[PDB]
């Protein structure tokens, strides 16, 4: 532990989701005795600086892995000098993105240190943190004011420094007494908010502060004192209440996180409060963790916060806080037994107050749900607090908020009903039951054949025993209806695949080799045993037949390969050229779009250094519908041989609306060109409706994965799911049957370290959650199931070879048995991308070897779409030459490779069938573990997924570093000889195209945006409005509109 109390503010830069490294740095800082105010990811400079200034820290640690770091730090250094924080030292992350010329530049600008990857290897990760902590080991109490004149005047930076003095007991004794004297005469209300651990203390507080801002039109000056007993023996702590605060980013709001001993509230808080009271605030809010009623004698009003899980009704007779609390908030009122929790608590408070002459429903016990946007429950609690604070001497304007009455929150958008909690377990039983039938029916089919076989052998010998036939006849009825038809069609099935054509229409079955050998596309088994035949027909039928283990289609398509390559760079014009380069000479126009971090967060490009640096870098910059049209110019989106994939999650409904309008306008253009006249009202509507049906493509939009470790979500999970459903409803209404609403991904999960079994199980579980959610909404299974794309990562692990086939069978069986859906719904279609986790910077030429083997098993196992990574993936975005080597891997396997001429080469293999069985079972067991945690959503409350992933990640690293798990070129066979974005004009282009778009729709802008908000308030279809909104509004405008009526995502520690 250092001399002074070293405080830090840590965060990831704006639009930066790579918050994996900064969460490691804040651990080492914490362990070395530093109080860390962690801000999480996606933090603007204006945010980080405001935090640093209010907390009054010695140092700031910022990680930047999305680029644009130079403009970012320059902004922060500038903004810190302007608002009295030049003594605060800014540090750069361990990102190897920043070249030496930029490190030297920024350090010369004002940045304390930027640690090069060279410094990482030399000093060590703990070494860099130790250096950074020692630099910030300075006393900040000397910068504190000596007169209250500054603080009382309204200076918040002076207040922040004054507190640093008061907290360290280095303030003048005469100054302190004069401070309390000022506070006593100030007469300002102090609300205390205490509660049990993990009850939503900060979440509810933030929402309550938001209530204050909305109700009083940001007229109130609120100071927030967060108290966390994390301060260990080393002196280090973690102050993570600020990360959950979204409504504090405003000049009238001030927040200070205090780290107190885990044993003993020190005599510092009543001073800190007095300081805020003297700073002429309107209201001081003080919150604590796990409830400790050591805050009661220091506040005017106390608020006990709890969850419905309090145990038996007798436990409430032990809680001292229920005897003092002026208000009680039962937060997370969406949980089970919340209703009974309310009556138990309300009765207990009535008993404690001995108010038998009152109604239990009148008690200050509120059922709140801070997680739900604009929750009336929270508002009801707020209405109560105001009346209490108002009577206790506080000036308040008449409220603008709906002054509704009641005590409990009025329900919520129930995603997965508690009755369907065990849905994953039910599916596990569904599959296992199918297998037990396979075993039983197989034995029946075997015996039936054995009897009639032995019966015929007796007639050839002479003596006959018809008693054998009596037993065989019993087997005929014992065998199921579908099982019997399977064996019946088997000889006929063999004749079909026997010929050279699959005879109406015909299809080639045989590809003749260079030697003259005939290679059958689909090779059928040669089993004599009818038990084996039935067993095979039920467990792994031919491609295109239930359970579609070897594929969902009969034969691989001649027109389109599974090839679909990831692209996206600079502005729409540049990517449009890269799209043509990849699909050069191919009838199969299969595009895969990647957006820049600015677009991925639903923002418009802007001059501000925060955003400007990010524009165009690492993905195409798409801000308006015009940009979208340029992106796919020339390409016929409605053409049957053209599918367009696009990677977007948060802003997915808006981007999809743009893509739809683009595809529609392409045909309106093609009509005005072919006829020379614009289509009439009836002609246009006929065209528009046709486009929606026949348009092919896929948008990712996996929201549940964004809270699984990616951390790139901008909207509240509940809101996104509502709009997600709005899209899926829209697809149904207009018969959009060629577009996939959500590409349920598991790639990001795998990159995080998850082994194949975990990746597959979680992804399927997530997919099943989306299914359960839509069913609870009221959609039919055959309406949304055929619109479900999947996304997996292929690594080197054995389980990857049988991943796709397992995913297909688990889906096909459950969809037919559990949900009773049609054939089109039982067919799981997925996209496989080779693993980037297996691609290393050490010996990059080896990566093509790994990417080949992964591509092979993907193609072997009849994947629906394949992306191949470049050999220099660990260093930069795929270059021009390097994207050809990636594309050649697919071309060589599909065209040159002989075994690939056969479309079911996996089938029959003893290894494949065993691995298929093993992996399938392992997934089912994982389904069960998640089910007994409340389903996927319930498990995410515990952070079960994120936890397991982080575990398996470290187990991989524990073996890779050790040498147990060999990696060629990395931990073995190391090389003796080998020791070791976006044009400025393009950024200006996007800015000009934006302001040009904005001026062109200035009249219809606000009108459309207001309509969009009202559609959320009136609980209408959001996507339906977006289909009109994107034609007069930009991405940023639409996103910001929804922020006001859908709320922003709240960060998790
Ligand atoms: C670090 C960041 C990494 C990332 O995020 S990368 C993610 C990017 N996303 C992707 O690469 C893939 C996107 N998803 C997709 O392309 C699709 O969802 C999918 C299902 C994988 C592929 O779709 P498509 O290739 O267009 O084909 P499809 O399965 O939708 O079906 C099209 C219709 O055409 C027909 N068809 C195509 N191939 C056939 C065949 N072999 N046999 C018989 N019929 C066939 C068929 O009619 C089918 O429609 P339907 O099955 O009758 O409803």
UniProtKB/Swiss-Prot annotation:
Q: Which amino acid positions bind adenosylcob(III)alamin, per UniProt? A: 18
Q: How is its activity regulated?
A: Is prone to inactivation during catalytic turnover due to the occasional loss of the 5'-deoxyadenosine moiety and formation of the inactive cob(II)alamin cofactor in its active site. The GTPase activity of IcmF powers the ejection of the inactive cofactor and requires the presence of an acceptor protein, adenosyltransferase (ATR), for receiving it. ATR, in turn, catalyzes an adenosylation reaction converting cob(II)alamin in the presence of ATP and a reductant to the active AdoCbl cofactor. The repaired cofactor is then reloaded onto IcmF in a GTPase-gated step, regenerating active enzyme.
A Gene Ontology biological process term = acyl-CoA metabolic process
Sequence positions that bind Mg(2+) 1: 202, 241, 287
**Assembly mode:** Homodimer.
Please state every residue range assigned to the domain named B12-binding: 5-135
Where does the record place the region GTPase chaperone MeaI? 148-391
Binding, Mg(2+) 2: 227-228, 241, 287-288
What segment(s) does the record annotate as region Linker? Answer: 392-547
Provide the binding site for GTP: 198-203, 244, 331-334, 941, 1052
| Pfam assignment, any one | B12-binding
Q: Which reaction does it catalyse?
A: 2-methylpropanoyl-CoA = butanoyl-CoA; 3-methylbutanoyl-CoA = 2,2-dimethylpropanoyl-CoA; GTP + H2O = GDP + phosphate + H(+)
What terms describe the molecular function in GO for this protein? cobalamin binding; GTP binding; GTPase activity; isobutyryl-CoA mutase activity; magnesium ion binding; methylmalonyl-CoA mutase activity; pivalyl-CoA mutase activity
Domain of life the protein comes from: Bacteria
Q: What is its EC number?
A: 5.4.99.13, 3.6.5.-
- Give the protein's biological function: Catalyzes the reversible interconversion of isobutyryl-CoA and n-butyryl-CoA, and to a much lesser extent, of pivalyl-CoA and isovaleryl-CoA, using radical chemistry. Also exhibits GTPase activity, associated with its G-protein domain (MeaI) that functions as a chaperone that assists cofactor delivery and proper holo-enzyme assembly. The G-domain of IcmF also has a role in its cofactor repair. Does not display ATPase activity.
List, alphabetically, the NCBIfam families matched.
acid_CoA_mut_C, acid_CoA_mut_N, IsobCoAmut_IcmF
Notes concerning its domains: Is composed of four functional domains: the N-terminal 5'-deoxyadenosylcobalamin binding region that is homologous to the small subunit of ICM (IcmB), a middle P-loop GTPase domain (MeaI) that acts as a chaperone for ICM, a structured linker region involved in dimer formation, and a C-terminal part that is homologous to the large substrate-binding subunit of ICM (IcmA).
> What is the official name of this protein in its record?
Fused isobutyryl-CoA mutase
Q: Which residues bind substrate?
A: 555, 590, 696, 740, 789, 824, 829
Q: What is the scientific name of the source organism?
A: Cupriavidus metallidurans (strain ATCC 43123 / DSM 2839 / NBRC 102507 / CH34)
- Identify its protein family: Belongs to the IcmF family.
Q: Which terms are listed as keywords in the entry?
A: Chaperone, Cobalamin, Cobalt, GTP-binding, Hydrolase, Isomerase, Magnesium, Metal-binding, Multifunctional enzyme, Nucleotide-binding
Provide the cofactor list for this protein: adenosylcob(III)alamin; Mg(2+)
Its UniProt miscellaneous note says: In many AdoCbl-dependent isomerases, e.g. methylmalonyl-CoA mutase (MCM), its G-protein chaperone is a separate protein.
């Amino acid at each position: 532990g250092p001399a002074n109390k070293v405080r830090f503010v840590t965060a990831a830069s704006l639009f930066d989701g790579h918050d994996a490294s900064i969460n490691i740095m804040r651990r080492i800082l914490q362990s070395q005795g530093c109080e860390v105010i962690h801000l999480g990811h996606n933090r603007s400079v204006q945010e980080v600086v405001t935090a640093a200034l209010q907390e009054d820290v010695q140092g700031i640690a910022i990680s930047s892995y999305q680029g644009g770091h130079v403009e970012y730090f320059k902004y922060m250094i500038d903004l810190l000098r302007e608002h009295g924080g030049e003594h605060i030292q800014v540090f750069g992350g361990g990102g190897g993105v920043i070249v030496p010329d930029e490190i030297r530049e920024l350090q010369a600008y004002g940045v304390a240190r930027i640690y090069s990857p060279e410094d990482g290897q030399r000093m060590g990760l703990a070494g860099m943190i130790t250096d950074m902590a020692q630099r910030c080991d300075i006393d900040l109490t000397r910068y504190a004011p000596t007169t209250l004149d500054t603080v009382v005047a309204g200076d918040r930076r002076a207040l922040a420094q004054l507190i640093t003095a008061l907290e360290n007991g280095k303030a003048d004794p005469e100054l302190v007494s004069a401070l309390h004297a000022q506070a006593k005469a100030a007469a300002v209300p102090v609300l205390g908010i205490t509660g049990t651990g993990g009850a939503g203390k900060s979440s509810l507080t933030d929402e309550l502060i938001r209530r204050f801002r909305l109700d009083q039109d940001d007229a109130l000056s609120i100071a927030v004192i967060s108290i966390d007993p994390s301060r260990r023996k080393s002196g280090g702590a973690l102050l993570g209440d600020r990360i959950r605060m979204n409504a504090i980013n405003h000049p009238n709001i001030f927040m200070r996180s205090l780290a107190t001993r885990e044993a003993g509230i020190s005599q510092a808080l009543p001073d800190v409060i007095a300081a805020c009271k003297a700073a002429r605030f309107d209201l001081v809010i003080v919150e604590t963790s796990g409830g400790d009623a050591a805050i009661v004698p220091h506040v005017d009003l106390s608020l006990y916060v709890m969850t419905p899980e309090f145990g038996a009704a007798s436990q409430l007779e032990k809680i001292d806080m229920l005897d003092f609390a002026d208000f009680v908030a039962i937060n997370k009122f969406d949980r089970k037994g919340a209703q009974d929790a309310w009556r138990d608590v309300a009765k207990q408070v009535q008993r404690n107050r001995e108010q038998w002459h009152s109604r239990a429903e009148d008690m200050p016990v509120y059922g709140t749900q801070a997680s739900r946007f604009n929750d009336d429950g929270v508002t009801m609690l707020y209405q109560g607090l105001v009346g209490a604070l108002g009577a206790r001497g506080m000036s308040l304007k008449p409220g603008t908020l709906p002054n509704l009455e009641g005590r409990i929150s009025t329900g919520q958008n129930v995603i997965v009903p508690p009755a369907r909690s065990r849905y994953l377990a039910e599916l596990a039983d569904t599959v296992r039951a199918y297998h037990r039938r396979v075993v039983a029916q197989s034995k029946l089919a075997r015996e039936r054949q054995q009897l009639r076989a032995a019966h015929d052998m007796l007639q050839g010998a002479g003596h006959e025993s018809a008693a054998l036939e009596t037993l065989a006849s019993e087997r005929d009825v014992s065998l199921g209806a579908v099982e019997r038809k399977l064996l019946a069609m088997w000889p006929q099935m063999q004749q079909a695949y026997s010929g050279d054509e699959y005879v109406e229409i015909r299809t080639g079955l045989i590809s003749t080799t260079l030697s003259g050998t005939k290679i059958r596309k689909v090779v059928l088994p040669r089993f004599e045993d009818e038990g084996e035949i039935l067993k095979w027909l039920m467990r792994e039928n031919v491609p295109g037949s239930f359970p579609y283990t070897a594929g969902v289609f009969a034969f691989k398509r001649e027109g389109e390969d599974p090839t679909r390559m990831f692209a996206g760079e600079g502005d729409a014009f540049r990517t449009n050229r890269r799209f043509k380069l990849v699909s050069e000479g191919m009838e199969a126009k299969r595009l895969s779009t990647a957006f820049d971090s600015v677009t991925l967060y639903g923002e418009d490009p802007h001059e501000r250094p925060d955003i400007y640096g990010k524009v165009g870098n690492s993905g195409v910059s798409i801000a308006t519908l015009e940009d979208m049209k340029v992106l796919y110019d020339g390409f016929d989106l409605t053409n049957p041989s053209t599918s367009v994939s696009m990677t977007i999650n948060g802003p997915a409904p808006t981007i999809l609306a743009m893509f739809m309008n683009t595809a529609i306008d392409q045909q309106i253009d093609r009509f005005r060109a072919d006829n020379g006249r614009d289509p009439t009202a009836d002609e246009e509507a006929k065209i528009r409706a046709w486009v929606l049906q026949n348009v092919r493509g896929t948008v990712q939009a996996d929201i549940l994965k964004e809270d699984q470790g990616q951390n790139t979500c901008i909207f509240s999970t509940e809101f996104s799911l509502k709009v997600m459903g709005d899209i899926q409803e829209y697809f149904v209404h207009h018969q959009v049957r060629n577009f996939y609403s959500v590409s349920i991904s598991g790639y990001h999960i795998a990159e995080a370290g998850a082994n194949p079994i975990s990746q597959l199980a979680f992804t399927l579980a997530n997919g099943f959650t989306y299914v359960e959610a839509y069913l609870a909404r009221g959609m039919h299974i055959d309406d949304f199931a055929p619109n479900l794309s999947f996304f997996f990562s292929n690594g080197m692990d054995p389980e990857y070879s049988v991943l796709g086939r397992v995913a297909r069978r688990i889906w096909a069986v459950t969809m037919r048995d559990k949900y009773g859906a049609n054939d089109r719904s039982q067919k799981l279609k997925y996209h496989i991308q080779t693993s980037g986790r297996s691609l290393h910077a050490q010996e990059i030429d080896f990566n093509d070897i790994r990417t080949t083997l992964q591509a092979l098993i993907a193609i072997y196992d009849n994947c629906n779409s394949l992306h191949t990574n470049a050999y220099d993936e660990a260093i930069t975005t795929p270059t021009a030459e390097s994207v050809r080597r990636a594309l050649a891997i697919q071309l060589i396997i599909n065209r040159e490779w002989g075994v690939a001429k056969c479309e079911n080469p996996n089938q029959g293999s003893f290894l494949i069938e065993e691995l298929t069985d093993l992996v399938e079972e392992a997934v089912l067991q994982e389904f069960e573990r998640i089910a007994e945690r409340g389903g996927v959503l319930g498990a995410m409350e515990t952070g079960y997924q994120r936890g397991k992933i982080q575990e398996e990640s470290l187990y991989y690293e524990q073996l890779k570093h050790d040498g147990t798990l060999p990696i060629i070129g990395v931990n073995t066979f190391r090389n003796p000889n080998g020791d070791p974005r976006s044009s400025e004009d393009e950024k200006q282009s996007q800015l000009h195209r934006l302001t040009e778009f904005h001026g062109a729709h200035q009249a219809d802008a606000e009108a459309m945006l207001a309509r969009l908000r009202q559609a959320v308030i009136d609980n209408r279809n959001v996507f339906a409005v977006l289909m009109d909104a994107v034609r007069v509004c930009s991405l940023g405008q639409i996103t910001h509109a929804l922020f006001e009526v859908g709320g922003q995502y709240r960060r998790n520690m």
